[PDB]
Amino acid sequence: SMIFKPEELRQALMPTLEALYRQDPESLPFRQPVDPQLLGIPDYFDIVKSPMDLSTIKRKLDTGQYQEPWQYVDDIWLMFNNAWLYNRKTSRVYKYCSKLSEVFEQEIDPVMQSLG
Numbered sequence: 001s002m003i004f005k006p007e008e009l010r011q012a013l014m015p016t017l018e019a020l021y022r023q024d025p026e027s028l029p030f031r032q033p034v035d036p037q038l039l040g041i042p043d044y045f046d047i048v049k050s051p052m053d054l055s056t057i058k059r060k061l062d063t064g065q066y067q068e069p070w071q072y073v074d075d076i077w078l079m080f081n082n083a084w085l086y087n088r089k090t091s092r093v094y095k096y097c098s099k100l101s102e103v104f105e106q107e108i109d110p111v112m113q114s115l116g
């Protein structure tokens, strides 16, 4: 497979993460890991087996933990899928998740094309 350097991936992908951080208030529940004790949802880790959030993804981009860009896409999707799984379909966080996913779908496609 074709190699991707960490600096190359950060430069290309960080603007798509920025697009999510720019969604205010919609990104706010996603900017830090879910804390089930604080949020009063003790069953969270029983339902969501692989937690993910924007701060974790940003750290991985910053430190160079992605070898290829689809690994980043996978983490973004994991974050969305967790929220759609756990939260009720009429809930604020479910709706915020849907908004972030719409933004991501629009931003990510030209970026992935350029990476090749």
Ligand SMILES: CCc1c(C(=O)NCc2c(O)ccc3cccc(O)c23)[nH]c(C)c1C(C)=O
Pocket (backbone or CB within 6 Å): 025, 028, 029, 030, 034, 039, 041, 044, 082, 083, 086, 087, 092, 093
């Ligand atoms: C519903 C708890 C939850 C949060 C969260 O952090 N809620 C608290 C929150 C904020 O941390 C910041 C702004 C909020 C603005 C509105 C409603 C909220 O609740 C907000 N984030 C995720 C991914 C979940 C679940 C379970 O999937």
